Ligand binder design. Sequence first.
Ligand SMILES: O=c1ccn([C@@H]2O[C@H](COP(=O)(O)OP(=O)(O)O[C@H]3O[C@H](CO)[C@@H](O)[C@H](O)[C@H]3O)[C@@H](O)[C@H]2O)c(=O)[nH]1
Ligand SMILES: O=c1ccn([C@@H]2O[C@H](COP(=O)(O)OP(=O)(O)OP(=O)(O)O)[C@@H](O)[C@H]2O)c(=O)[nH]1
Length: 288
Amino acid sequence: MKGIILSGGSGTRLYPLTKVVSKQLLPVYDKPMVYYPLSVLMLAGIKDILIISTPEDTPRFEQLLGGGSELGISLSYAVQSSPDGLAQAFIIGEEFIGDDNVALVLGDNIFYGHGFTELLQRAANRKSGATIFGYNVKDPQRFGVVEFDEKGKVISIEEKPEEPKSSYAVTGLYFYDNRVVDIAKNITPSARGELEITDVNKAYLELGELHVELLGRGFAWLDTGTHESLLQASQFIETIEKRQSLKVACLEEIAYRMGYISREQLIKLAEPLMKNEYGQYLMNLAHR
Ligand SMILES: O=c1ccn([C@@H]2O[C@H](COP(=O)(O)OP(=O)(O)O[C@H]3O[C@H](CO)[C@@H](O)[C@H](O)[C@H]3O)[C@@H](O)[C@H]2O)c(=O)[nH]1
Ligand SMILES: O=c1ccn([C@@H]2O[C@H](COP(=O)(O)OP(=O)(O)OP(=O)(O)O)[C@@H](O)[C@H]2O)c(=O)[nH]1
């Protein structure tokens, strides 16, 4: 399984924070927003990852994150010329994906909850079909909406329905088999002029292999689209971390716990950062 992080768009709602740079380079409490979805692909066991952004921001993600070798993974970069839809991720990434399975995650999505890694690994370990992740939300009409039966199996999926058939939004995290590339090539732009991830999901539903992992209320799927919600997301993260003395989406910690890097390698990473609390945290993990 490879992974893609779609991390472009203008981010106009956040202006002037995004006057020059992309929204996914902004802090969520104590680390850049993009760390969060990156950590989710890493916890899924995915080690070969493509980050897609705008022409002007793609090099800034590259400078921030590098090629991944210190995390024991491979990061690649590609540009999206215009934000013509989520599904364009698979066209942009066609060469990268090759004949592989692939997951897509939105650069601005933040997931958190007990047992989440098990769900991720299960999705990533699927050899066939698609896994989406549903989450009960206040205003489902603002999202992809998944309708499911009493055995948790999907009956419909609709992009921002006038009349939502359920309360469960389809969040920005998707796992696919290799059929997604030709599916994305064969869908056509909606009325808003975008290649819709919902139409990709529709294709898998028709194929009888659209699986939904429903995330209950013990999970947090956090909003980062407004200044207000960015701030709430940062406060949520702070409360979690300061109580536990454990960090959410610390990439180096994840690389170590996943076995991508060794203990000796982790200590090497902590050493040049020991003047700050993040470095000290990595060193304390090394001692665990
Ligand atoms: O071509 C694009 C289109 C979007 N984005 C970014 O992707 C994220 C999501 O885009 P957004 O406009 O906020 O969401 P919608 O496209 O309106 O909704 C999508 O994302 C929702 C989850 O937030 C899903 O529930 C919907 O099904 C799916 O269409 C944002 O950070 C965008 O900047 C890109 O990077 N490139
Ligand atoms: O090093 C890590 C480990 C986990 N996580 C994040 O912590 C959340 C819970 O992660 P898990 O799904 O591992 O559950 P847990 O740690 O609460 O339970 P144990 O199995 O350890 O008893 C998930 O959202 C995951 O992404 C990190 O951010 N970093």
